[PDB]
Amino acid sequence: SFVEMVDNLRGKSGQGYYVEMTVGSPPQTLNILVDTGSSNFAVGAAPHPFLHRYYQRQLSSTYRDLRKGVYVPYTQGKWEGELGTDLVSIPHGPNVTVRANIAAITESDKFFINGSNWEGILGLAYAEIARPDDSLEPFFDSLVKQTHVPNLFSLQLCGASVGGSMIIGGIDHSLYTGSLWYTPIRREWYYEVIIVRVEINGQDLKMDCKEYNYDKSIVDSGTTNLRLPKKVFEAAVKSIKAASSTEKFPDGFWLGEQLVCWQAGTTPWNIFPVISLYLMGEVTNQSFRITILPQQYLRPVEDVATSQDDCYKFAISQSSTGTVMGAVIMEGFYVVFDRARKRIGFAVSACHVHDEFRTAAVEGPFVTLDMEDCGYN
Numbered sequence: 001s002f003v004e005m006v007d008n009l010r011g012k013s014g015q016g017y018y019v020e021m022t023v024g025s026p027p028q029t030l031n032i033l034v035d036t037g038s039s040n041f042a043v044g045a046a047p048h049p050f051l052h053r054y055y056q057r058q059l060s061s062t063y064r065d066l067r068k069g070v071y072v073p074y075t076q077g078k079w080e081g082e083l084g085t086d087l088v089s090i091p092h093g094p095n096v097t098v099r100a101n102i103a104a105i106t107e108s109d110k111f112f113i114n115g116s117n118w119e120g121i122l123g124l125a126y127a128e129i130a131r132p133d134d135s136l137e138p139f140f141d142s143l144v145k146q147t148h149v150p151n152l153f154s155l156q157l158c159g160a161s162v163g164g165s166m167i168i169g170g171i172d173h174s175l176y177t178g179s180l181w182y183t184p185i186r187r188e189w190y191y192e193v194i195i196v197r198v199e200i201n202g203q204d205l206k207m208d209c210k211e212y213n214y215d216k217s218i219v220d221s222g223t224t225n226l227r228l229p230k231k232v233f234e235a236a237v238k239s240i241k242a243a244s245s246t247e248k249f250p251d252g253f254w255l256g257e258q259l260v261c262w263q264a265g266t267t268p269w270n271i272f273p274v275i276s277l278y279l280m281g282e283v284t285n286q287s288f289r290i291t292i293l294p295q296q297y298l299r300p301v302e303d304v305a306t307s308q309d310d311c312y313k314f315a316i317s318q319s320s321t322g323t324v325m326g327a328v329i330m331e332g333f334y335v336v337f338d339r340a341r342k343r344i345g346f347a348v349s350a351c352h353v354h355d356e357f358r359t360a361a362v363e364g365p366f367v368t369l370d371m372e373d374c375g376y377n
């Protein structure tokens with residue numbers, strides 16, 4: 001019965017993917033950002049220049065105040081509000097209704113995006129990183145405990161203005177091709193995984209694999225870019241520059257600041273290398289890899305001028321909190337968050353990226369010794 005959940009996600013490029021939900025009685029409709037990098041369910045509950053609508057607790061008879069404030073900081077943006085509980089449902093999701101914790105956002109800073117079309121956020125990670133503490137049961141935990149919905153979900157994010165699917169409670173085999181390859185969830189807080197090798201155009205970056213996971217590596221649908229630790233970011237950029245030395249790009253380009261443009265349909269994709277991330281597998285000394293095409297880490301942006309040329313922004317940035325496999329990485333892949341078996345699966349998506357001579361892929365098996373030494377402690 002997953003067919004009704006296909007295409008239940010919408011959004012704008014670089015503004016996150018959202019699903020429709022309803023809270024309170026009578027049901028109040030709101031678009032909620034899907035974020036695997038956080039664990040709090042929260043919605044705007046007060047007027048805001050960027051909000052077209054918000055949660056009105058006074059209009060819900062099922063609403064319950066928990067009389068307890070909350071603050072939640074994100075890599076970018078933050079908000080604070082009041083904790084409470086209410087009935088919640090997902091129109092284009094499983095046909096059920098559950099009582100879950102809800103944070104009524106009363107104040108925020110650089111959180112709501114102008115024209116994003118969403119007024120809330122659904123943290124799908126674990127309680128361990130929930131605010132104010134792990135006692136605040138996350139939405140998915142509530143859903144699984146109050147219903148018969150299996151303990152797993154999958155995400156198929158499609159690029160370009162953007163759409164996709166969030167299959168709650170299962171895997172929809174028509175949304176991907178080939179085989180699903182699984183990597184262990186190292187620890188249940190963020191969806192933490194271990195990267196055991198990185199190659200650019202088939203060239204090993206030759207770095208201590210611990211560097212790839214310093215101080216952790218996570219899968220985060222709520223982050224746009226591929227974020228890499230300083231040392232890895234530097235090595236990656238250097239390699240990508242040399243590969244594209246043919247042309248010249250402003251130093252601000254590699255910083256995500258300035259953007260580059262080309263005559264409509266003349267983008268020199270071939271000069272940009274593919275990136276291969278090898279992930280720890282399910283059996284001893286075994287891993288698999290996912291290959292990222294330039295069409296993924298070069299996010300298309302509207303021409304700042306009155307021109308009809310294709311402009312893009314470097315979607316790879318430096319991080320100080322570990323590797324982050326954001327939406328640009330998840331796009332083109334079908335990703336299964338198999339919480340029941342503590343693993344994350346990857347397969348080529350049906351709405352995969354397209355290149356003339358190259359193609360994004362998930363390949364295995366590969367032999368990799370000492371993978372456990374790649375984890376940072």
Ligand SMILES: CCCCNC(=O)[C@@H](NC(=O)[C@H](C)C[C@H](O)[C@@H]1CSC/C=C/CSC[C@H](NC(=O)OC(C)(C)C)C(=O)N[C@@H](C)C(=O)N1)C(C)C
Nearest residue numbers: 014015016035037038073074075076129220222223224225
């Ligand atoms: C100061 C951080 C303290 C630690 N906090 C966390 O780790 C929290 N989790 C997180 O912050 C997640 C790891 C990140 C989370 O998904 C948050 C969700 S914020 C709501 C998301 C809106 C969709 S636009 C996404 C945006 N795109 C973007 O910036 O594009 C350009 C770079 C081109 C401008 C982006 O990428 N945001 C990153 C940076 C980010 O912050 N994402 C919670 C666990 C409490």
